[PDB]
């Protein structure tokens, strides 16, 4: 399934991950270290899922699971505060 996935697409998926976790219109947030840490995390996650998945659907599924978890954590902590 790797033969049908391009570098461009992977990059875009990373970006989609980032935006789904922390949607930000701002430009000055993208220059902040925490944001950079998020992008880095996303790249790592995407890599791990690309390595692990045995199909495109599985890949998407795993990425989605990870996004969901991060979102849930974030929501929980927001409610806590």
């Amino acid at each position: 399934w790797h033969e049908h996935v391009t570098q461009d697409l992977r990059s875009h998926l990373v970006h989609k991950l980032v935006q789904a976790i922390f949607p930000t219109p701002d430009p000055a947030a993208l220059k902040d270290r925490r944001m950079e840490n998020l992008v880095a995390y996303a790249k790592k996650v995407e890599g791990d899922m690309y390595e692990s998945a045995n199909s495109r659907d599985e890949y998407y599924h795993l990425l989605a699971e990870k996004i969901y978890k991060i979102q849930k954590e974030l929501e929980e902590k927001r409610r806590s505060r």
Binding site: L9, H12, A64
Partner: peptide, 25 residues
């Protein structure tokens, strides 16, 4: 955790829509 499956599918869809976004003409 109940609506988890729903959201997961939503996220899957969102991610898949990234394929058909990339094109020229």
């Amino acid at each position: 955790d109940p609506e988890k499956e729903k959201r997961i599918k939503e996220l899957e869809l969102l991610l898949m829509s990234t394929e058909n976004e990339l094109k020229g003409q």
